[PDB]
């Protein structure tokens with residue numbers, strides 16, 4: 001009810017301040033769903049045209065091999081040789097790989113879950129780069145300027161997969177497995193162009209139920225690594241989630257829209273056809289407790305030292321936290337302290 005995905009329509013004035021807007025959507029309860037859609041003002045555009053990127057190199061395209069049955073699957077990401085956007089699009093749009101005919105989303109979603117183990121598609125995933133023009137100042141994924149910037153501030157080391165933008169060139173049936181962000185951070189995803197991207201979300205207050213369910217389904221993966229979901233290989237159909245009483249919601253992201261994922265917000269999804277999305281991680285003051293308590297991959301990976309954040313934002317707790325006495329319990333319903341001005 002209050003864990004349902006929400007869509008926001010900021011005005012141009014409201015859009016200019018990223019962090020303030022994030023605070024605003026949390027004061028509205030957006031974080032409870034674990035995922036929110038943000039439709040930018042009509043006048044806003046991050047790039048004049050996308051007709052000048054055909055020679056853009058996808059260095060490590062991945063063939064997505066999926067094995068499984070009865071709504072439970074494991075995705076094996078097979079590296080293919082480098083290719084350009086032009087070559088990628090030719091494959092995406094060919095008879096062999098293009099989107100099937102469909103009337104309603106529910107029909108396309110059925111095709112996805114029935115055919116994800118067949119005819120493995122190629123995902124032009126994790127390409128370092130941005131499609132934003134240099135002068136765009138609003139919601140610029142390249143430079144959000146959140147408190148996540150503090151790691152680079154004190155050491156200069158940029159952790160690969162954190163605080164840098166990534167591009168994802170999708171084709172029909174390419175997917176992202178169930179996961180939460182690295183260090184349980186926030187994430188932003190903008191669909192630059194093409195066919196939609198469909199998303200599934202589990203509210204952070206029900207995240208441990210999803211983990212317990214995936215542990216029961218893959219006991220071998222769980223014994224090897226407690227945090228095996230962080231490998232981003234596990235696919236679980238909505239039918240299985242429904243059967244085992246895991247609450248979830250679904251949303252389709254169209255070209256020109258943003259998706260925000262919240263700390264400990266489990267999400268998965270798939271691309272409807274040839275498209276391109278830009279993404280990065282970011283943080284608010286609320287994330288600090290999430291980063292301290294993040295259950296990380298012990299086999300295996302992205303790790304951020306919390307010491308800098310605790311020392312700056314929670315110095316009274318520093319000694320208690322460094323001694324293993326920080327017994328703090330996270331309340332997933334509470335908005336970020338920055339949202340106080342809206343409540």
Ligand SMILES: CN(CCc1cnn(-c2nccc3c(=O)[nH]cnc23)c1)Cc1ccc(F)cc1
Pocket residue numbers: 077123125126161168175176177181182187189197232267277
């Ligand atoms: C380090 N790599 C990013 C990790 C990462 C974190 N969030 N996230 C995603 N989150 C949301 C949406 C998407 C999406 O549409 N498409 C791809 N990845 C998405 C992907 C690993 C990796 C990327 C893609 C993939 F398939 C499998 C592994």
Ligand SMILES: [Zn+2]
Pocket residue numbers: 179180181187261267
């Ligand atoms: Zn993600």
Ligand SMILES: [Zn+2]
Pocket residue numbers: 224225226227228231297298299300
């Ligand atoms: Zn692991």
